[PDB]
Design a protein around this ligand. Structure first.
Ligand SMILES: OC[C@H]1O[C@H](O[C@H]2[C@H](O)[C@@H](O)[C@@H](O)O[C@@H]2CO)[C@H](O)[C@@H](O)[C@@H]1O
Ligand SMILES: [Ca+2]
Ligand SMILES: [Ca+2]
Ligand SMILES: [Ca+2]
Length: 545
């Protein structure tokens, strides 16, 4: 229940704060900015992976689960971080990455060393078919999901990068070692986990070929490994052997789960996580189809209410483009950032803020493929270039859909590199840091940052915004997203003009008192309550007694 009332902040440590001038974020960097997060009102910090890693996938390829990434510091730095976080009245959850390891993990080095060895079946090996790969599956990062090993003359599976071989969850020995490792971390007093790629751990037995109607070189392979029947057996054991033994929060990153199939994932009774990151609102690729967004988020509000589940609320993370671009408007950057904030943050659930979201940071446009880092898009670039796509065509996809958009340095001030580093950043800063930065926003009472500060405050001060029942209003309005939160004798009315235009809206009325809790435009003297005249991306929250 503390996790129900919490607001969480997600840190991408490579790009949060560089404390020693090599252009790479680090743990002492995070420590140096804990004042910022405490003052924001954050309750829980989720930090992306900080473990030993070759960084083929920036931390999500782990070669030692019990050692800190050299770039980021030492275990002593981590211990200091956890101690400082805890003394500041915050909690910290770690990123648990156990679908796959680095190919430089000692388990895999042994596993690949000989066709027969005690670690061979820790991973997923198969001989080829017809002088090619074992099947036609595509990696999520493009190319084959199988990599040939010359020494042992077999392929190993990698859903993600070539340097991320999948662990074999059908091997009890593997599961036992993972559970020991998880509990080792929990014994240090961390407060839980965000659980990476967790819907991918069950593969269809025998890894059969997928249908290939369009005759591709490789077939997108989600139907072979995403949320496959049999997965719940593993996740139930994971919970029983680890999570259930501690008072922690868990949020599972669970692609392929829908609002009607979330029962075994988050139900109060028997659910394997406290909440999940669901993907249904993150694949709406013009004018945003607002009513489709209403349908999806409302499905999840109503769906989880029915099974006493709990939503994880979010619009941004290290895998997505920036939300002003995705859901708002660059023509109304500040206003749409605040509108989006009220919209997602005040539904029923635990809200997550991704670093820079609270500033209204936006997408970046680098001209050179050398300026990007994301293994996914770098692969995409090579493959599509060879197939004949022009540089421009490809960069368009990268600019408009690439997750590197969310990985540019956190924008602290207007000094060199926006104060992220004294050195040359591993990823270039967005040039708009001259306009968009923490220092500027602290002093402006109408900044995006101070709007988030207010959202956190009113959610904390009014129980109806935590435990109140959600109901969608004005479903057919293609511009206005409005909804209520109701708890006993209190009703909050959240009104969001999700359009770049002025709009009229009838107040969806029976109250003894009304109060405006938050608003991103100045209130108009002569405006009547009943006839809202809302400015582009205007949001208001009313509290009704
Ligand atoms: O650790 C690999 C990869 O996993 C997570 O994101 C995945 C997600 O789990 C999948 O469902 C899939 O569709 O693609 C995502 C990657 O694009 C991590 O969040 C991600 O950073 C990481 O690379
Ligand atoms: Ca550094
Ligand atoms: Ca089995
Ligand atoms: Ca008005």
């Amino acid at each position: 229940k503390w996790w129900k009332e919490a607001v969480a902040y997600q840190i991408y440590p490579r790009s949060f704060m560089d404390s020693n001038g090599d252009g790479i974020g680090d743990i002492q960097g995070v420590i140096s900015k804990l004042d910022y997060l405490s003052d924001l009102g954050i309750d829980v910090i989720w930090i992306c992976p900080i473990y030993q890693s070759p960084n083929d996938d920036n931390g999500y390829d782990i070669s030692d689960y019990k050692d800190i990434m050299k770039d980021f510091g030492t275990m002593e730095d981590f211990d200091e971080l956890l101690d400082e976080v805890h003394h500041r009245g915050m909690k910290l959850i770690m990123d648990l990455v156990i679908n796959h390891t680095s190919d430089e993990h000692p388990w895999f080095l042994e596993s690949r060393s000989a066709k027969e060895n005690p670690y061979r079946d820790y991973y997923i090996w198969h001989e080829g078919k017809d002088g090619k790969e074992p099947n036609n599956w595509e990696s999520i990062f493009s190319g084959s999901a199988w990599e040939f090993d010359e020494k042992t003359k077999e392929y190993y599976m990698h859903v993600f990068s070539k340097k991320q071989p999948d662990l074999n969850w059908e091997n009890e020995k593997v599961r036992h070692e993972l559970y020991e490792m998880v509990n080792w971390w929990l014994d240090k007093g961390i407060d839980g986990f965000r659980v990476d790629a967790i819907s991918h751990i069950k593969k269809v037995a025998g890894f059969p070929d997928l249908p290939n109607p369009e005759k591709l070189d490789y077939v997108p392979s989600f139907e072979g490994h995403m949320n496959r029947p049999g997965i719940q057996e593993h996740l139930k054991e994971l919970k029983e052997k680890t999570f259930a033994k501690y008072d922690i929060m868990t949020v599972g990153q669970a692609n392929g789960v829908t609002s009607d199939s979330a029962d075994e994932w988050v139900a109060e009774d028997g659910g394997n996580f406290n909440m999940i990151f669901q993907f249904e609102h993150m694949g709406l690729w013009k004018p945003l189809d607002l009513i489709e967004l209403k349908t999806i988020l409302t499905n999840w509000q109503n769906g989880l209410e029915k099974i006493n589940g709990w939503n994880a609320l979010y619009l941004e993370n290290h895998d997505q483009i920036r939300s002003v671009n995705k859901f708002g408007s660059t023509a109304y950057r500040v206003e749409s950032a605040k509108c989006l904030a009220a919209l997602y943050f005040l539904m029923k659930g635990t809200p997550f803020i991704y670093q820079g979201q609270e500033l209204g940071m936006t997408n970046v446009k680098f001209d050179s493929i050398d300026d990007y880092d994301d293994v996914g898009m770098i692969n995409y670039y090579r493959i599509q270039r060879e197939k004949g796509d022009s540089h421009d065509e490809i960069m368009k996809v990268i600019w408009e859909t690439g997750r590197d958009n969310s990985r540019t340095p956190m924008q602290w001030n207007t000094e060199k590199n926006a104060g992220f580093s004294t050195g040359n950043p591993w990823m270039k800063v967005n040039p708009n840091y001259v306009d968009i930065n923490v220092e500027e926003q602290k002093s402006d009472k109408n900044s995006v940052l101070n709007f988030y500060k207010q959202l956190i405050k009113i959610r904390k001060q009014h129980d109806v915004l935590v435990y109140g029942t959600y109901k969608l209003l004005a479903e057919e309005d293609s511009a206005i997203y409005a909804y209520t939160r109701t708890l006993e004798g209190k009703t909050a009315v959240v009104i969001c003009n999700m359009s770049p235009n002025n709009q009229t809206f009838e107040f969806p009325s029976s109250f003894t008192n009304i109060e405006v809790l938050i608003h991103n435009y100045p209130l108009d003297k002569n405006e009547t309550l009943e006839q809202c005249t809302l400015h582009p991306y205007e949001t208001r929250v009313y509290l009704i007694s």
